Design a protein around this ligand. Structure first.
Ligand SMILES: NC(=O)c1ccc[n+]([C@@H]2O[C@H](COP(=O)([O-])OP(=O)(O)OC[C@H]3O[C@@H](n4cnc5c(N)ncnc54)[C@H](OP(=O)(O)O)[C@@H]3O)[C@@H](O)[C@H]2O)c1
Ligand SMILES: NC(=O)c1ccc[n+]([C@@H]2O[C@H](COP(=O)([O-])OP(=O)(O)OC[C@H]3O[C@@H](n4cnc5c(N)ncnc54)[C@H](OP(=O)(O)O)[C@@H]3O)[C@@H](O)[C@H]2O)c1
Lengths: 235, 235
């Protein structure tokens, strides 16, 4: 059996992504801190399709050692798709920002994502049908006032993922890497401002998965979702 | 007594930057792991100008708690300029990259720089004459094959620093933030390929310090150094 691994599966995009992959008949490994929420999701998925396998892994990915330990626990499973979706944003002027929150953004949005991505590439680069999908942000391509550090973490995610995707293509690897860049969603007034629901964003994630473009990005102004080629300059 | 604080001062750009600021009459706080190298630099500086105050701080900035401990010690001094120059690079394909090296790159190139930058902004944003200079890379604006993770760390540094610089301007803060983006230097056959020496880069750093532009960048193709406005898209 093959598995789709989703971090940040207890709420938001990751929760709806788990449901979307389940509707496609995928076995799932769902990871987040809130164990009860993950168990709730598992029950919903199995009530929908009793034949699926769903593995719950409650773990804090902001601790480096937990990232490596999670990956080693996953070695007993054939991973078809890894979605690095867990992440955190904190909006503030830099001068009075809570630096412990900053540390969290760095550990989760950058470190956990790059380590899990790199371990997955190491082991699965040559395996047919594999996909790595990293969740960035439209703010990983445009700096947004009051989100300077958060945006910088997403510039990391976008540039890392584009670079890796192009490296894999140049190497003729079987594994593909792709980046999803949501704009405003319900997890961030609603009467006057455009946003996507988490369910809509999971649908866009499936579209990215199903197509052969590296970038799936929501324009921050028009809210149109577009599949497109890498955005950043490349040597 | 005011001080210019330079991380990564034991060799390379930071070493030459220390000498350049000493020639401008600045007292210095010089930081790196190799205490003996910092002590040698101090002796070279005082041979030139015996009246300068030069404080040696040997510390490993890849350890989070050390970054905060260092900043606490720096509270004993009036900091005029902070230069976040300590950094390193590792060139590899992702699939076989040393992840210990990756962790160190993340900790030093991103975490130490963002923490020290943010603490400095908190305390000095309203203090006339202060400057924060972060050392990125031309690879923080162009992704370079075989340097995917390194480039992503520098995309972080560039986007963080541009965002912060614009935030300070919008807030009418006295503190200025700027980013230096070197291309190839001697720290990275030779007779066919252009590069800047560390001394030349330190001269470009002084030019950035002296002028009214946020970005000082070496074009990867022409090796021309240009002072310019922020490069990344901004909302
Ligand atoms: N405009 C934007 O930039 C934008 C908008 C929407 C989404 N996004 C991105 O999309 C991703 C999903 O976000 P979302 O909107 O769905 O928000 P969300 O509802 O807050 O989901 C975040 C997920 O990550 C989990 N997680 C958080 N911290 C964790 C930790 N230390 N260890 C393990 N898991 C952790 C959270 O669950 P637990 O608390 O149970 O651990 C949750 O399942 C994120 O990368 C976010 O940055 C970006
Ligand atoms: N084209 C490019 O991308 C490019 C080219 C050149 C330079 N740069 C950037 O310029 C900066 C300076 O680099 P450089 O060329 O001058 O290289 P370098 O000669 O290797 O200098 C690096 C400095 O950082 C120090 N340092 C390294 N690790 C440290 C740690 N854990 N804790 C504290 N200090 C540490 C090193 O001294 P110790 O070993 O004594 O700690 C040294 O003083 C870096 O940010 C680098 O990324 C970029």
């Amino acid at each position: 059996y093959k598995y789709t691994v989703i971090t940040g599966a207890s709420s938001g995009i990751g929760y709806e992504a788990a449901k979307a992959f389940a509707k496609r008949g995928k076995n799932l490994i769902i990871i987040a801190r809130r164990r009860e929420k993950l168990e709730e999701l598992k029950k919903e998925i199995l009530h929908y399709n009793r034949s699926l396998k769903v593995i719950v892994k409650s773990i804090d990915l902001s601790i480096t050692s937990n990232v490596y330990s999670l990956y080693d626990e996953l070695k007993n499973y054939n991973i078809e798709t890894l979605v690095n979706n867990a992440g955190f944003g904190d909006y503030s002027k830099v001068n009075n920002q809570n630096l412990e929150k900053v540390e969290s953004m760095l550990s989760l949005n950058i470190e956990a994502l790059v380590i899990l991505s790199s371990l997955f590439v190491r082991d699965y680069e040559k395996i047919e049908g594999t996909q790595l999908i990293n969740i960035s942000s439209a703010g990983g391509y445009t700096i947004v006032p009051n989100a300077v550090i958060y945006c910088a973490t997403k510039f990391f995610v976008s540039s890392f993922t584009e670079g890796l995707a192009r490296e894999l293509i140049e190497a003729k690897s079987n594994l593909k890497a792709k980046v999803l860049a949501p704009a405003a969603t319900e997890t961030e007034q609603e009467k006057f401002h455009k946003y996507h629901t988490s369910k809509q964003m999971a649908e866009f994630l499936i579209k990215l998965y199903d197509n052969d473009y590296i970038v799936g990005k929501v324009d921050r102004n028009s809210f149109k979702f577009t599949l497109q080629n890498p955005i950043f300059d490349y040597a």
